[PDB]
Write an enzyme that holds these catalytic residues in place. Structure first.
Site, PDB file in Angstrom:
ATOM      1  N   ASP A   1     -38.533 -11.870 -58.730  1.00 29.87           N
ATOM      2  CA  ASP A   1     -38.958 -13.183 -58.255  1.00 29.87           C
ATOM      3  C   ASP A   1     -39.769 -13.873 -59.346  1.00 29.87           C
ATOM      4  OD1 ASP A   1     -39.367 -15.083 -55.848  1.00 29.87           O
ATOM      5  OD2 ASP A   1     -41.351 -14.766 -56.545  1.00 29.87           O
TER       6      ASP A   1
ATOM      7  N   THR B   1     -37.644 -21.863 -58.373  1.00 27.87           N
ATOM      8  CA  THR B   1     -38.896 -21.656 -59.092  1.00 27.87           C
ATOM      9  C   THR B   1     -38.684 -20.955 -60.426  1.00 27.87           C
ATOM     10  OG1 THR B   1     -39.310 -19.575 -57.906  1.00 27.87           O
ATOM     11  CG2 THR B   1     -40.232 -21.592 -56.961  1.00 27.87           C
ATOM     12  N   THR B   2     -37.605 -20.183 -60.561  1.00 25.92           N
ATOM     13  CA  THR B   2     -37.293 -19.561 -61.842  1.00 25.92           C
ATOM     14  C   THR B   2     -36.609 -20.548 -62.780  1.00 25.92           C
ATOM     15  OG1 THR B   2     -36.240 -17.648 -62.910  1.00 25.92           O
ATOM     16  CG2 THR B   2     -35.036 -18.720 -61.117  1.00 25.92           C
TER      17      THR B   2
ATOM     18  N   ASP C   1     -37.921 -19.416 -46.247  1.00 25.59           N
ATOM     19  CA  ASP C   1     -36.989 -19.966 -47.225  1.00 25.59           C
ATOM     20  C   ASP C   1     -35.977 -20.883 -46.551  1.00 25.59           C
ATOM     21  OD1 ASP C   1     -38.244 -18.558 -49.193  1.00 25.59           O
ATOM     22  OD2 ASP C   1     -36.751 -17.064 -49.420  1.00 25.59           O
TER      23      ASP C   1
END
Lengths: 521, 98, 528, 519, 103, 99
Positions: free
Chosen positions: A53, A86-87, A389
């Site tokens: 993550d 987010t990555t 999510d």
């Protein structure tokens, strides 16, 4: 040749800034995609953690450089606004910084680079939006399919046929067909051990994690209740300063007990005078939430008590119930109470959770609580994350309606168009936009490599197929190649791609503009 | 007079540093823009200034680039006196630290 | 005890070392000698950054353990207290004499022979100085007032005050006259106090011939002014160090009540004592009340109802300023208040100064005063501090002009005249002393040369011109171009120093040189 | 496995004697420039961070406090000179130094420390007999009392900053000593105070005690300033109600007393002032502050007050007015009061100061020094001190010898004459002893800036011709008759100084070991 | 040798240079803040936990201390400009530094 | 105050020139006059000589400094033109250099 002597070297700071920031992005890059590689971190406590993550990794990377840390804030902004990608927002930042570094070496002033990239970002967003597949909140099934997709990558996917519509209905209960910004913090996911994954409920008023009253005489249930939120403690006088009580016999013990009980009685009577039916006490370890002696008085008054309610639960209560906090028994009055049709404790597979329904108060706001059930901690924790999510996916669809194909497709579509269109621009415009467009391919390039595919082959196929085809084509790790990712149901909300283009511009703009670091002491 | 001549020219050289910094920060070639701008203001045309968005020389009245007279008096006045304060210093004497 | 860890210097080497130590001090302050002298940055023990060219402040802030340098500081202290002008010149000149002594010692002239020669040379220098003196107070009083102002105007030109110095020169002239009677011509500096506040510009400064308090009234609703009241005996002021109320402690009370009967009386006592104390003000016949302490709410209402304006929390010196100016007393208690203790003035009022909220309270006699306060304003602390100190220097100048009417022209002209006289007399000695007499004259030359160097002028061409003009044309004082004026010849430029100032400058610098030259051994221990 | 010392030091042998000499010479070198009326001043920084400037050998050596165990002998013997004689402390160390300097080469040549000391003891006896023979018993012969004392102070002040102003300061010194008890003249009875400002010739002589006038507080000065026949009272306690510095809290048992406490304190001071009135004082002194209430009360009672008086002055006031100081006011009797013939306020220094004058009971006096600088005033004080001492000694001790080195040269001659008949090693020591006597006229010439070689040679020739009183003249670089010029000092100064210098010389030379216990 | 007790002392050659080098050091703080296209400075305190980025010349001059006692003079003067006038802080600081740089 | 910096420092050469030349002149100075003092010189070949002859002193002084050696040529010119004063001209030169 002979050129600027460069005795004063501000470029040395920008180089250090770019090198530090790009190092962070490359570290995250290798974890991109369902086939990405894991990161292992040994924490300051000696614990070993393993995760792919990006955001969790970034927080634990403990980045030191003042500017490289800004790439962590970027992932926080993505998590706050979209809740996904987010990555990818940091990875694109790294690649775009690499474009800036090359442009600097080519003789483009950092000021020109920052503004030109912003202009490219403006066009990138327009390209992204036009190519998306539009949605409508009126199509409940469509929303379920969108949530079901994001749920298919979770540990327990066999219950996605339940968690998907739960996320959909949870949003729709508070967000109708005509809404722009939905704050999913008003959708409270409450866990309790017991039951099964499908065994969930949507409650209007609140779901609390705590029991009410177990002792003899307690009402255990109240209809047509007024509810107050207590931040003070109800206990006999127990000061912190020096004090002594001397008891040499049961006769003096009786006197002392009457003094302690009369104190609590006066508090309990005032609570009754306020016509408060249910007490919801914020958790504290300073003094007893409600002392047993107070419970005996409150029980006789037919007042329910719920103890050890977490701060986050108290904050939700202040919005769902229409009630207000009371800082002290001195100010405990009716004006600070809410309303509810029914307050009850539910014992289902040993749950014993207090919930409120039928608030019907003008001070109430569109909130909803969800009951998450499951035997093992892993079940309730995975369910909560899965619903969270899924709620973020739907929130994205409200802010900017539509989904785009995944697998790097929008990055190939944007880059391909920008590279062609940039050829019509003049001066630094074309040269910079070619580097901007090229930087975008770090995503489909990384996805190909992490999937075990030949890096050049996949990107080559993606370029050719998008020139003749459309956005729907992209990388599918499940098919291990370039295919129709739309038909494979690999979809992401528009907001995720839109936000990533914005954040990459904002971060690089911010980094390039820093020509020095100074201490303030 | 002779001795003061270079000081007066030095004052002018300081004044023209602001349009140099403005061009440099905007990412433009300050040597070209400032030198050409000076030739514009010198050979009449005293309306021209820096276009810090296009990287060229433009008429400030057409672009609407104006600054308060009072503020410009304050900037010149303060900068002049500010220099004088340190120009009058050639020794630094410190007392016992506490 | 503990002979070790000590420093010692003695003998011929000490003579060179001691003079070099004196040179080190001069090498710092010499740069500030002249109306165009350069400023220093003076860093306080706490890191406070101040800028000044006051040689007296600089030498005071110079903290050193060099015993020879300390002797130079002692010299500057004497001149600062006595005259207040030559605080830089006496040290620079004394160094110049020591520099000459160094060469004289190296050539084989005994330090005592140098000391004796310098003394006799100083006598010649003063003997000539007298020939160039003139009177300011002589003849028409209008000429005295003209020159007195012009002397102040010049003395102000060395500080930031120079911008608007016209007003500060007037303050110095009025201040020195206002505290001085024409017949006695004695000026007591302590009758001219300096005060100022941050705000406004230095051009807003003025001389106030009364007392100013930096304090407000005890109650916002209380009248801000008392007038003479249609011909009555001015305003009567009650100046005390005790508030007109039953005093109450700020720590412990320890007031024991033994009965309910006492309890009820005690609560009443306080309420009644508030009334009695204000009633005593009316019995005294006072118009306004000035106390070291403030007032409680009950006292403020009682003073309000009885039209007795009162000022709260007035400091010690401020109470004395009123008692002195109003020819009254400070009365520790209330029972002694009467016409024989209360102060008298013509008006007390609150003055606003533009946007400055100080709202100072001014007490005026509206007639000839015994004391004045110089009120200085300015846009910052350093501006007020420097302009205020500038008045101190100008006040010293006009003080000396009143006391001793004899003046000489400055700009270094006096030093050149004295240098020429000593030089011409040196050749008449025909003996050993000739070396010291010539050296003394050369030491004097260092002053007009310093004025040249600090002005950006060639000191060699300047001194050559100075001596040439006073030999070829007329001995009449010829000055330097340090002020940037069209020409020298101070007769038309009004750069004038008092005689007693220049006389002491030369004699004291010579005495200091001897003070150091006669030191043949220094032993320095530690500091406990 | 054993040692003898463990940090215990001891050093023995002839080398230790020479080492002791070297350390002792160092003390001489510190003091050698202080000899003579033109002696140089020395700057000493003490541990108290105050600087002392003086050419007084006693002051310098007492502050030097040489640590070396042997050199401290020079400190002790100088203190003995300071106690037994009161002067000559510089010359005692110098003479002792040179004698030890000559002892060094004698030790190197194998002459025992006994033989050196023995010769010195004999040489002193020979010198003392000559010094007595040279002494003159003279008082007012062909003169008068003030005429001698005027010449004595005038000589002391020669070639000083007050040389031209000697006509003023010489009178002060002569009056100062003659104002004392004629049987026991004590320099401690002559006070000197520094007041800045004015010219030096404007200095004032006062028979009583002056004060510094420490008052600046509003309301002061409004009290009588002059008394014809005042009674004087001195207190050790303050007379003030509310100072510009102090304060108090009010604590009561009853609310009505709140205001009473302020007035009660007024009464406590008033009652003390009232008891002073009952005593019948005209001037009231205190070492502590006296405030406004005291001034207003005293003024209305025709009483003058002055507080914050230096502790040294308060004692001298009692010594001036003949009264007695008291701490309390309830127990004071009229016998505690002093009396003056005048109280007045002076304008000395262009600033007002209080003083008593014409105190019939005085055993003291006060000299007020004026001048344009504290450094000059300090020079005046030093000149006055020397002038006072020579006036004191000329009045006290009529048995004199010529100064200026005249006695040392006459002693030197007779010592050399004796060596003509002294055989053996004693001849070497008697010669060295005579040589040491010459260092005084030598360093007097050198410190004065003279050609010491020329002057010493002329002095030797003069005494060889029988001119037994010629010495160093400091006004003109030559030699002349110091007796005729009234350059005198008591004979006991030369007798005791020479005995003392030798005693220190022999004691130091007698030491062949130093033991020091460390740890 | 005079002074002592570990005080700072600079003479003509040193103090004169320090006066100019100091003023230049002040200019270097804000020369990048001039114009709408000026560059940012990253500021961080000893705690590391207050890291901020600004192009406000007044904030930088107030936030960033300098140890040059002559630089402190110019910074204090720039403060007055910012507080009393409300604009021109960078322009005065630059012009002051450039006037002294040429001097 | 403050004046010209002169970053390049030819004054260091002028100082070295005067310092070296005055040192030579001060040395020979002590030999001036019929009562002048003698010098001892150990030559590079080990022979040690004593003389008060000004020229011999400077010749055997073995002066190295490029400028101080000029004083040898001065004594040669003095000897060539006058034949006397070879000491005095060097002493005067030193004093004028000190001036």
């Amino acid at each position: 040749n002979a050129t600027f002597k460069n005795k004063e070297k501000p470029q040395e700071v920008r180089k250090a800034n770019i090198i530090a920031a790009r190092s962070v992005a490359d570290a995250i890059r290798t974890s991109l995609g369902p086939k990405g590689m894991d990161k292992m971190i040994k924490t300051s406590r000696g614990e070993i953690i393993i995760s792919n993550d990006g955001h969790t990794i970034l927080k634990q990377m403990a980045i030191l450089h003042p500017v490289a840390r800004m790439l962590v804030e970027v992932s926080a902004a993505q998590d706050s606004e979209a809740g996904d990608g987010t990555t990818s927002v940091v990875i694109l930042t790294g690649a775009l910084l690499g474009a800036a570094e090359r442009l600097l070496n080519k003789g483009i002033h950092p000021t020109i680079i920052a503004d030109s990239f912003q202009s490219a970002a403006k066009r990138s967003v327009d390209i992204l939006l036009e190519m998306c597949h539009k949605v409508s909140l009126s199509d409940r099934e469509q929303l379920v399919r969108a949530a079901s997709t994001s749920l298919s990558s979770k540990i327990v996917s066999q219950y996605s046929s339940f968690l998907a519509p739960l996320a959909v209905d949870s949003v729709l209960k508070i967000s109708d067909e005509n809404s722009k910004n939905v704050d999913l913090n008003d959708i409270r996911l409450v866990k309790k051990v017991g039951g099964t994954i499908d065994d969930t409920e949507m409650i209007d008023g609140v779901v609390l994690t705590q029991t009410a009253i177990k002792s003899a005489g307690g009402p255990t249930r109240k209809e047509k209740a007024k509810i107050g939120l207590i931040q003070f403690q109800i206990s006999p006088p127990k000061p912190d300063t020096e004090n002594n009580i001397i008891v040499n016999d049961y006769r003096q013990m009786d006197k002392i007990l009457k003094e302690e009980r009369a104190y609590l009685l006066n508090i309990c009577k005032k609570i009754k005078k306020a016509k408060c039916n249910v007490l919801l006490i914020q958790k504290s370890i300073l003094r007893d939430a409600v002392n047993d002696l107070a419970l005996h008085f409150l029980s006789k008054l037919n007042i329910m008590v719920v103890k050890d309610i977490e701060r986050e639960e108290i904050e939700f209560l202040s919005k769902g119930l229409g009630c207000k906090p009371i800082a002290d028994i001195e100010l405990f009055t009716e004006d600070r109470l809410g309303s509810a049709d029914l307050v009850e404790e539910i014992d289902s597979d040993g749950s014993k959770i207090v919930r409120v329904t039928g608030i019907r108060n003008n001070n109430a706001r569109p909130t909803v609580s969800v009951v998450i059930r499951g035997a093992n901690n892993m079940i309730i924790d995975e369910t909560e994350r899965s619903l969270h999510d899924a709620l973020c996916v739907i929130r994205c669809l409200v802010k900017e309606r539509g989904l785009i194909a995944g697998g790097g497709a929008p990055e190939i579509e944007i880059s391909r168009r920008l590279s062609k269109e940039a050829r019509s621009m003049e001066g630094v415009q074309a040269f910079i936009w070619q580097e901007f467009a090229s930087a975008l391919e770090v995503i489909p390039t990384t996805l190909a490599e992490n999937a075990g595919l030949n890096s050049i082959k996949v990107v080559t196929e993606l370029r050719s197929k998008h020139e003749n085809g459309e956005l729907n084509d992209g990388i599918s790790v499940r098919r291990s190649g370039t295919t129709n990712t739309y038909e494979e149901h690999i979809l992401q909300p528009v907001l995720v791609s839109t936000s990533a283009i914005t954040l990459a511009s904002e971060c690089v703009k911010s980094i390039l503009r820093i020509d020095d670091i100074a201490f303030s002491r | 007079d002779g001795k003061k001549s270079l000081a007066v020219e030095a004052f002018a050289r300081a004044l023209r540093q602001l349009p140099t910094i403005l061009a440099d920060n905007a990412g433009f070639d300050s040597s070209e823009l400032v030198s050409k701008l000076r030739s514009s203001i010198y050979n009449g045309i005293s309306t021209s200034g820096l276009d810090l968005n296009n990287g060229t020389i433009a008429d400030m009245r057409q672009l609407g680039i104006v600054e308060s007279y009072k503020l410009k008096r304050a900037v010149v006045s303060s900068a002049s006196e500010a220099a004088e304060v340190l120009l009058r210093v050639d020794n630094i004497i410190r007392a016992r630290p506490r | 005890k503990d002979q070790g860890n000590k420093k010692r210097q003695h003998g011929l080497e000490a003579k060179k070392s001691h003079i070099l130590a004196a040179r080190s001090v001069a090498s710092i302050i010499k740069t500030s000698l002249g109306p165009r002298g350069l400023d220093k940055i003076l860093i306080s023990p706490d890191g406070e950054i101040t800028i000044t060219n006051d040689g007296a402040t600089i030498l005071s802030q110079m903290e050193l353990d060099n015993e020879i340098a300390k002797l130079l500081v002692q010299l500057s202290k004497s001149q600062d207290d006595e005259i207040g002008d030559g605080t830089t010149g006496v040290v620079v000149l004394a160094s110049a004499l020591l520099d000459q002594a160094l060469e004289l010692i190296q050539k084989g002239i005994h330090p005592i022979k140098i000391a004796n020669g310098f003394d006799e040379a100083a006598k010649l220098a003063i003997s000539k100085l007298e020939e160039t003196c003139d009177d300011i107070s002589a003849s028409n009083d209008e000429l005295f007032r003209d020159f007195l102002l012009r002397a102040a105007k010049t003395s102000l030109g060395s500080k930031i005050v120079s911008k608007d110095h016209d007003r500060f020169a007037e303050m110095a002239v009025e201040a020195v006259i206002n505290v001085m009677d024409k017949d006695r011509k004695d000026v007591d500096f302590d009758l001219i106090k300096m005060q100022g506040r941050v705000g406004g510009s230095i051009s807003d400064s003025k001389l106030i011939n009364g007392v100013i308090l930096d304090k407000d009234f005890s109650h916002p609703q209380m009248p801000k002014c008392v007038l003479p009241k249609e011909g009555s005996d001015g305003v009567k002021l009650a100046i005390l160090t005790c508030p007109f109320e039953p005093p109450k402690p700020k720590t412990k009370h320890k007031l024991d009540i033994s009965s309910v009967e006492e309890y009820q009386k005690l609560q009443t006592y306080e309420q009644d004592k508030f009334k009695e104390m204000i009633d005593d003000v009316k019995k005294a016949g006072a118009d306004v009340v000035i106390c070291q302490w403030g007032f409680d709410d009950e006292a403020n209402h009682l003073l309000l109802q009885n039209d007795l304006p009162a000022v709260r929390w007035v400091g010690g010196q401020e109470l004395e300023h009123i008692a002195i100016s109003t020819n009254g007393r400070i009365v520790p208690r209330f029972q002694d208040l009467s016409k024989d203790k209360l102060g008298t003035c013509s008006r007390i009022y609150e003055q606003e100064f533009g946007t400055t909220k100080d709202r100072m309270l001014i007490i005026e006699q509206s007639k000839e005063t015994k004391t004045v306060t110089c009120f200085v304003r300015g846009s910052n602390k350093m501006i007020v501090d420097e302009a205020e100190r500038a008045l101190h220097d100008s006040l010293c100048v006009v003080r000396n002009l009143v006391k001793d009417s004899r003046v000489v022209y400055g700009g270094g002209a006096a030093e050149v005249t004295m240098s020429l006289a000593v030089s011409e007399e040196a050749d008449k000695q025909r003996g050993i002393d000739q070396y010291a007499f010539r050296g003394f004259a050369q030491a004097l030359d260092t002053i007009p040369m310093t004025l040249a160097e600090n002005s950006g002028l060639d000191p060699i061409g300047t001194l050559s011109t100075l001596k040439s003009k006073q030999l070829k044309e007329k001995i009449s004082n010829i000055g330097v171009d340090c002020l940037g004026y069209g020409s020298n010849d101070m007769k038309e430029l009004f750069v004038v120093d008092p005689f007693i100032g220049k006389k002491q400058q030369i004699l004291l610098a010579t005495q200091l040189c001897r003070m150091i030259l006669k030191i043949d051994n220094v032993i320095i221990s530690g500091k406990d | 496995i054993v040692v003898l010392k463990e940090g215990t030091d001891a050093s023995q042998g002839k080398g230790q004697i020479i080492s002791n000499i070297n350390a002792c010479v160092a003390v001489q070198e510190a003091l050698k420039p202080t000899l003579g009326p033109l002696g140089s001043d020395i700057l000493i920084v003490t541990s108290n961070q105050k600087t002392t400037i003086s050419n007084d050998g006693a002051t310098i050596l007492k502050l030097l406090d040489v640590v070396h165990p042997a050199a401290k002998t020079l400190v002790d013997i100088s203190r003995a000179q300071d106690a037994e004689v009161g002067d000559g402390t510089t010359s005692v160390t110098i003479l002792a130094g040179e004698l030890m300097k000559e002892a060094k080469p004698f030790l190197e040549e194998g002459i025992s420390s006994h033989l050196i000391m023995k010769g010195y003891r004999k040489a002193v006896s020979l010198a003392v007999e000559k010094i007595n023979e040279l002494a003159v018993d003279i008082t007012s012969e062909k003169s008068s009392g003030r005429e001698l004392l005027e010449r004595c102070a005038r000589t002391a002040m020669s070639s000083k900053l007050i040389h031209n102003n000697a006509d003023f300061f010489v009178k002060m010194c002569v009056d100062a000593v003659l104002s004392l008890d004629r049987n026991d003249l004590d320099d401690k009875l002559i006070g000197i105070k520094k007041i800045p400002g004015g010219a030096m010739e404007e200095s004032l002589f006062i028979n009583g005690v002056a004060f510094k006038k420490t008052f600046s507080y509003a309301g002061f000065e409004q009290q009588p300033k002059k008394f014809n026949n005042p009674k004087i009272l001195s207190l050790n306690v303050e007379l003030e109600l509310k100072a510009e510095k102090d304060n108090a809290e009010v604590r009561v048992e009853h609310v009505e007393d709140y205001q009473a406490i302020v007035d009660a304190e007024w009464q406590l001071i008033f009652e003390k002032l009232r008891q002073v009135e009952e005593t019948g004082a005209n001037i009231v002194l205190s070492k502590l502050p006296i405030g406004d209430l005291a001034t207003q009360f005293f003024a209305d009672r025709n009483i003058f007050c002055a507080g914050r008086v230096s502790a040294d002055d308060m004692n001298r006031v009692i010594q001036a007015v003949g009264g007695s100081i008291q701490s309390t006011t309830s127990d004071i009797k009229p016998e505690h009061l002093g009396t003056c013939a005048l109280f007045e306020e002076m304008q000395i220094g262009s600033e007002r100061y209080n003083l008593f004058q014409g105190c019939p009971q005085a055993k003291t006096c006060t000299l007020l020094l004026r001048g344009g600088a504290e450094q000059v005033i300090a020079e005046v004080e030093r000149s006055l001190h020397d002038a006072i001492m020579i006036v004191k000694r000329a009045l006290q001790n009529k048995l004199i010898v010529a100064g200026g080195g005249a006695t040392e040269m006459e002693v030197s001659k007779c010592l050399r004459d004796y060596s003509k008949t002294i055989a053996g090693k004693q001849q070497m020591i008697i010669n060295a002893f005579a040589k040491a006597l010459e260092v005084i006229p030598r360093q007097l010439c050198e410190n004065a800036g003279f050609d010491a070689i020329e002057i010493l040679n002329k002095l030797r020739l003069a005494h060889s011709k029988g001119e037994k009183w010629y010495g160093v003249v400091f006004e003109t670089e030559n030699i002349g008759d110091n007796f005729a010029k009234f350059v005198w000092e008591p004979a006991l100064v030369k007798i005791n100084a020479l005995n003392s210098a030798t005693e220190a010389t022999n004691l130091i030379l007698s030491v062949d070991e130093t033991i020091t216990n460390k740890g | 040798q005079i002074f002592g007790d570990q005080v700072t002392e600079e003479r003509a050659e040193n103090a004169r240079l320090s006066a100019f080098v100091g003023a230049i050091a002040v200019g270097d703080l804000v020369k990048s803040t001039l114009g709408p296209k000026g560059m940012d400075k990253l500021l961080q305190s000893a705690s590391s936990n207050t890291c901020m980025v600004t192009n406000d010349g007044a904030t930088i001059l107030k936030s960033i201390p300098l140890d040059n006692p002559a630089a402190k003079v110019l910074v204090n003067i720039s403060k007055v400009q910012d507080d009393e006038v409300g604009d021109g802080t960078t322009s005065v600081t630059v012009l002051s530094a450039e006037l002294l740089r040429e001097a």
